[PDB]
Design an enzyme around this catalytic site. Sequence first.
Site, PDB file in Angstrom:
ATOM      1  N   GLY G  29       0.804  -1.228   0.000  1.00 30.00           N
ATOM      2  CA  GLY G  29       0.000   0.000   0.000  1.00 30.00           C
ATOM      3  C   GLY G  29       0.832   1.270   0.000  1.00 30.00           C
ATOM      4  N   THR G  30       0.157   2.419  -0.068  1.00 27.60           N
ATOM      5  CA  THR G  30       0.842   3.721  -0.096  1.00 27.60           C
ATOM      6  C   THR G  30       1.383   4.059   1.290  1.00 27.60           C
ATOM      7  OG1 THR G  30      -0.926   5.303   0.512  1.00 27.60           O
ATOM      8  CG2 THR G  30      -0.916   4.503  -1.782  1.00 27.60           C
ATOM      9  N   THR G  31       2.265   5.052   1.352  1.00 29.60           N
ATOM     10  CA  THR G  31       2.914   5.424   2.608  1.00 29.60           C
ATOM     11  C   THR G  31       2.007   6.322   3.451  1.00 29.60           C
ATOM     12  OG1 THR G  31       5.071   5.363   1.476  1.00 29.60           O
ATOM     13  CG2 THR G  31       5.009   6.362   3.673  1.00 29.60           C
TER      14      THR G  31
END
Lengths: 195, 244, 235, 241, 250, 111, 243, 240, 231
Positions: G29-31
């Site tokens: 997933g994204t940060t």
Amino acid sequence: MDIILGIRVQDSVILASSKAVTRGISVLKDSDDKTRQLSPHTLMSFAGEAGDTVQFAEYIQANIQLYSIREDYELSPQAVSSFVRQELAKSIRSRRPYQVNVLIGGYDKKKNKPELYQIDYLGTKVELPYGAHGYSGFYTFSLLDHHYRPDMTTEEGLDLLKLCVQELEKRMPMDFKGVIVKIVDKDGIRQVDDF
Amino acid sequence: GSRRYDSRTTIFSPEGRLYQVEYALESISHAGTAIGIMASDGIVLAAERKVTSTLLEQDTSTEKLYKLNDKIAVAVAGLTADAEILINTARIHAQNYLKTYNEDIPVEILVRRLSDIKQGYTQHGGLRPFGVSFIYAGYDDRYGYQLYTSNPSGNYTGWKAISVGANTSAAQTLLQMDYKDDMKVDDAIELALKTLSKTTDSSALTYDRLEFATIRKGANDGEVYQKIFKPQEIKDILVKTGIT
Amino acid sequence: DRGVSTFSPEGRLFQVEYSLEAIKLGSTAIGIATKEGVVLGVEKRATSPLLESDSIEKIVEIDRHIGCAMSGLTADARSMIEHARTAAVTHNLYYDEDINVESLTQSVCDLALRFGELMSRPFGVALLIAGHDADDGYQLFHAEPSGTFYRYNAKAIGSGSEGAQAELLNEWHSSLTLKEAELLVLKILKQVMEEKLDENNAQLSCITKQDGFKIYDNEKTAELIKELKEKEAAE
Amino acid sequence: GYDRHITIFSPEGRLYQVEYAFKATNQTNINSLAVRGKDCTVVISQKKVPDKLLDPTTVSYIFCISRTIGMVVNGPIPDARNAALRAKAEAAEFRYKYGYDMPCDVLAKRMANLSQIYTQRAYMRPLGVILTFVSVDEELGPSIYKTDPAGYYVGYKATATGPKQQEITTNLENHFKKSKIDHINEESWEKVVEFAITHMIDALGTEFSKNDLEVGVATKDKFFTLSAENIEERLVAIAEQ
Amino acid sequence: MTDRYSFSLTTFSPSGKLGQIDYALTAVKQGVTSLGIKATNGVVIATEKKSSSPLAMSETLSKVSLLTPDIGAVYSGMGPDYRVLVDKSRKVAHTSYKRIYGEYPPTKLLVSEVAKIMQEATQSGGVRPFGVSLLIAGHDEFNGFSLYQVDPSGSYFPWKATAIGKGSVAAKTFLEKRWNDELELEDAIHIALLTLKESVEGEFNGDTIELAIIGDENPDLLGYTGIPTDKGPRFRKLTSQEINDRLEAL
Amino acid sequence: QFNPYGDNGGTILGIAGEDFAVLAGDTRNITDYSINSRYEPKVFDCGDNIVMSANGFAADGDALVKRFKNSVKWYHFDHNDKKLSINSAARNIQHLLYGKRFFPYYVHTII
Amino acid sequence: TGYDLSNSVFSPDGRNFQVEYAVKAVENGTTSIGIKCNDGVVFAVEKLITSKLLVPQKNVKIQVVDRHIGCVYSGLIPDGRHLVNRGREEAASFKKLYKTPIPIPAFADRLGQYVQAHTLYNSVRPFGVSTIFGGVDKNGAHLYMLEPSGSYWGYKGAATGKGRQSAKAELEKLVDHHPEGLSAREAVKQAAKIIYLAHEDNKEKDFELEISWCSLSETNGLHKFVKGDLLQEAIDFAQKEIN
Amino acid sequence: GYDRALSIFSPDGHIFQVEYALEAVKRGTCAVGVKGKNCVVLGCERRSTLKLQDTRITPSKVSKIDSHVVLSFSGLNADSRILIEKARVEAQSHRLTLEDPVTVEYLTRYVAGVQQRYTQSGGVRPFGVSTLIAGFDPRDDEPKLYQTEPSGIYSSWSAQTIGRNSKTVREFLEKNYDRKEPPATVEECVKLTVRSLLEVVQTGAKNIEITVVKPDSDIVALSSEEINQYVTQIEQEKQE
Amino acid sequence: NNYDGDTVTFSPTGRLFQVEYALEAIKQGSVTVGLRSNTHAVLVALKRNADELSSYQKKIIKCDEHMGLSLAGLAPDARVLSNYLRQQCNYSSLVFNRKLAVERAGHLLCDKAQKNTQSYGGRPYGVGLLIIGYDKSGAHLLEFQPSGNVTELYGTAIGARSQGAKTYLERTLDTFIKIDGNPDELIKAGVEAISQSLRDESLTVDNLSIAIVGKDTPFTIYDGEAVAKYI
């Protein structure tokens, strides 16, 4: 409803059951048959609360008919009366109890005896030589106490029954439009058609 | 989820058999042999216990023969604990009938309800069947003396003489040789014993490895007595017929 | 194994797709819509000569203005018909009117995907539902176990379907009379039926606004069969 | 073998899921130890905070279950907290129902029974933890009772748990072989804590700063945990000796 | 969520074995030896208190449990399975008997109840059988003294004397040689202590041996006086001291 | 003992012509001897050329009208935007009302 | 083997592979990050701009629980929403019975126990998210990070997603170089910088920044989104430090 | 409760559990029904590989559902009891509410309905049973014979057989049954039925049961001798 | 592979294959497009027939007076989800006298889909949806996918060959975003977008479905002769 009688004699049981159906100030019908055949040698007459009487009778009828098919056998009058009592005994503590009183007149083929059972809506069973429900008993019990003999013939039984009907037609306040009479013996159930 | 671990106890093989029933019958075929023999004047139940130890309490026991009511008993072949579950059900079912009709339950009706329970575990619920076969010995006033067996399939049939458990093949042939319709109770006792004596997997048959019962009209007139033989009475009936 | 409600990697439901395979094995049924009525016809396909062919009931009334023909595992349709009938009668009770054919069909199709780990598997039977209502007139619908339904001018389902459908594709136009449509169903049925078509191994029916849904007797159909042959030798 | 995936018997009579839940017990790589004084029950556990971004104060495997009962867990923190929450609930309910404080050993039996069920019932997995319960029970005095995934429990003079548990166990065995008593013959808990840290140091063969440890003490009528400074004070006393 | 395991985990193999019962019995084979001996005026049940660590306090772990004031039980196999059976057994003695008849159940019947519980773990959805065999010893007014064995399958048998667990085959033979129908309770205790020394490896004393009797009523152990018909429990656990007195006259 | 009903007064009236119909009602709302509002309408356009008024206990009247309006909305959703005929609305309202036979809507209803 | 085919099965090592596979979804997933400061906490997240067609500012990812808590997560977004819905129920029930708003450590365990419960049965799947959350209560500021296993701790700063290591490194510097505390307005700028720095590990698509904060002094203990002038100011600060 | 979908579709479109239930029927003792011009006759094989049977108390293979309808079957005996019980209860329930006993078509349809339900419900397997249901509608003299099978399909038959070697006897009946002219008498119909069974059975010993149903609840079983006379008579007429 | 038996199982790289297989049925679905200005929002859908004798399957469903969607994939699933939406819109009206925000509609659908991706025995929905609506903050378009992911957009397309229309809409962005106060122009722009996705077929009168909602326009559907104007 109202008047239902039974007399047990030597070789048969006789049920007399009034023909009137009254509601308010109107006699709605004068030829009502307040009875059901539970098995070939078992008859049940009934009186009590409108709706409950026929519903209960037909419900019992269906159960006994179901038993007969399943076992290919006819339950004894004693056994049927015990079953009916239990159903009423259960009913009395229900949310809405059946308010129905019954007489069970059967001929036991294993014993070759006629049998009469009186059972009220509470599930109170008694085997008797003669029986009655409602106010009928207040006249018929003492009359039969006098006139009944245990070894009477089917024909003597019907005369004894005439006496009961005559007295009820004399002293009871309501017109019950007479009775239908049926005889239960070794040969089964038949209806006397002129009373 | 859990589908992974489901055996599917209530399914059909491609041949149209019920795996679990077949396997429960295999289980039963390793249990001690029990015999029912029906005579004109009574019924005999005999059963051989599974290989005893000299230190078992023999008299206070009851592994094979169970009283259902005053007119009906059973001989067991299979898991004892499974059988007790079913027995208590039957004992209750008998009492409901007596309560409802004020008459002792006819033998078949009790046999049918028990067999209907067994059948249920083979069609729904995903549980294993009861690993039990019963020989029912009873009397009612419609058919007189009756013998039945039921098995894990929920099937039941009536017999003149029958065995369940181990070596029913051998046992059935021997009964089929010597059984006769006019036979009396004491003749049937002897037959039941001579049969177990020949089908046993032991060296010799002794009182301590046996349970025995009779249903006779052997009280006072048109009435029925159940007798679960005490060990001494087995010991005696084993000399009287000269097996020891 | 693996779940009843599982998707295939192609994005289709295994169990639905497999039920479609059972429907292919079913006996053939055909419906044609006209401005004078909708005709439904079926292949009875008695498995032996001793079985009394009129006891085979693959055309069925839903209400007076709606009828239904089936194909596949036909025992599965009992409860589908039962639902449909109740939906129709119930609608009339709540609204004092006839229930639209499309609404009826949508109600039946709502049952379809009510399965999984609600019933244990999808239905193994397709339906042709045909009827009339004042809003959209004469209609024919194909109802699948997937829960999807299409309106059709004409449609065939069952073992003979893809042959029969190509045939209907050629023969259907927007001016067919009822008699024309009756014959066409008879014609195309004989084309795809194994045994030779007669009045005992096939059956016709129509729904008309005027007389409602009617299943034809075998005498009425038999003349329509005879009339079909005479007109086919006649060119 | 699907008998390896759920809690049913293997042919040689074993429960592999229970055995594997025991191996999850050491997955944190922490050792714990508990001992009894005359007046008290001390429990110590290693404290490893490998990540610098963590708030060290929130990192703990010791729980205050009731006013009188402390519990230290050996195993992953999520299962550990699950067990702690349940134990707190069970202890509070016991007080309400029966009108007195749940004894350490009873709570231990109760949690052992819950653990047993997961070994017999199939849809529930065992918790991969070993629970050590401590108190100064009003009837039994200083008390250590310990639970495992098998549903087993028993009382202890003293006990140890973790990957290097056998070392600490023999260390402690040897001390009691010598002293010939059931407990640490010491007046103050401060010196019992000192004993516990000392015999941990010897057995494990490492030195500890104030942030390398975690300490719980049970006295009459309360169980509490020590701050870094309470421990640092206690480390100092060990050194000058 | 929820138990989706509504199906049996014990089923019949093609050979007819019930695997999980067999495997539970194997688990009992591994278990520490326990035994029971029936005398004319008492019953004795005994086992080894094999400890898991010498830091454990093996008094806190009681393998021999009182079920009613006249019934006791001991086991071989899985201790935690045993523990919960003892809880369930004590409760069923009340719920399905004492609360109905105002008196404790007779031995055979309490045993029967336990067997019912163990049978159900053999057939109900989503459970394994219990991994224990039980020896239940008790007394009741109309049956006198008795001793039963209960297995993972739910089967139970009465015994004059027997042993279960690790060294059961050896111990059962030892008992056959020494058992007679005239043993007095003190004699049966002496035999039990001899039989157990065979299976015990390490220490053999009152702190490694757990032993209880079903004998005379114990008025000193009742807790109150004033009811002539209540004379006290027949179940008694021998103290660590009491065992050692018997070990010198051995 | 709590009485779940009240009486909000007012009166309504409907007449039908050959190619029209009217449904009128006063706009007064009362409890006991007090006026709650001099203008609170109780006759409503329900769509599909149906007008409705449920006069009596206004909380019950508002519940019923609200429910019927919603019945029209779903009749459209379920039967392809079909118009609800007045005779069909009447039957639908019978079921709405009779559904509370044992705890009635305290209203005279006219559409 | 086959130990990894069913949730809540211990492998012979003693692990629950299904949880570890859920972690792979999180790592994908994204940060997203959280920074604890003087009197509050700051949350920020990387929103990949897949297309021009995404309406900017209008796919909000940080969520509020109650009035005083903020939650952000990386991984399976719907799973994160499920967890926040549960969080909102838990908080509402706590406030209903105890009046006071739910303390952060108390709220942390509510999510913890719920997530942990999804590692107990095979009839549920573990959560596909790590969740950074926190706020201000009567004892001050708290920041938490919660994993699919149900494991959680308190944090000085925390990070998860594809750029977690890069973000972690930067958070450590901050902790080291500011032992006496960071300010709220400072932490907002720092958060902006760190998301920009961790975007290197996800640099195909460009992205939209999203920040929120609860501060005793700057937001009055309540959770608010950082927008407009303060947000633009932090984007500028960040653009500065990558160049 | 136990939920599993046991009856499900295969890739080819078959429901194997339904099909395997049919194999169980194939395994069952043969049974046959033949309807005359004024009667229906139900004949049933009984496996004679069991002597020491008590036939007084062993469950007979034909069952009365009501006083005017009978049901025979092939397949699992235990399964048939469940269907029989349910049918008997519905028969009484129908009398109670409609004030008329069931038609044969209705009763059949009900039993068939039950059988279908077990082919798409969770936690249950299909009935390993097919039935022949025969009788006369109330106040009607046209004979009725229906067949049901595990899938739930049912239909009417001039004559039909089910069970082991039913293909052999269906073959027989197919060439021996004139649709145009059913057996005009009871005696004629009972013969044709026995004949068909003799193709498959063995001796006409304790092997064949016959039950005859006439209008107005006139149902009676035959005894050994009565049957034996038919067995004897045909085998004399055989040697030709 | 071994990890695609049900939605409750994770693959070793952290994927849910059953969700991905549901996502796949969408790709087989007929193309449908959505776009909006600041005043109106438009759906355009290419319908699909079974053969020349069949009707064209409807792809657009009305949810409230101010909201509705189009579908691509399993149509029964769209019926279930649209029906769920109709009730949520309806609840908001009856209880709060409030038109349900399009953004909330999205959140509700996301959460409903998600529950079918975490429990045993279920299955993901096998349909994608494009929701348009006009609420208290103007025109909206949403892309729903059965993974649970819902996204707000100026325009988009889903189904077979939707990438054609999607690219075009990306180019056209600055043009169509400002087609304010002009309905017929926003529709034509939508019809042009969906034409980028056609192959071997082109738009006919019983082929094409259009819906619009906006400032002074109740959500209304156009079919048959009503769309002739746009071919």
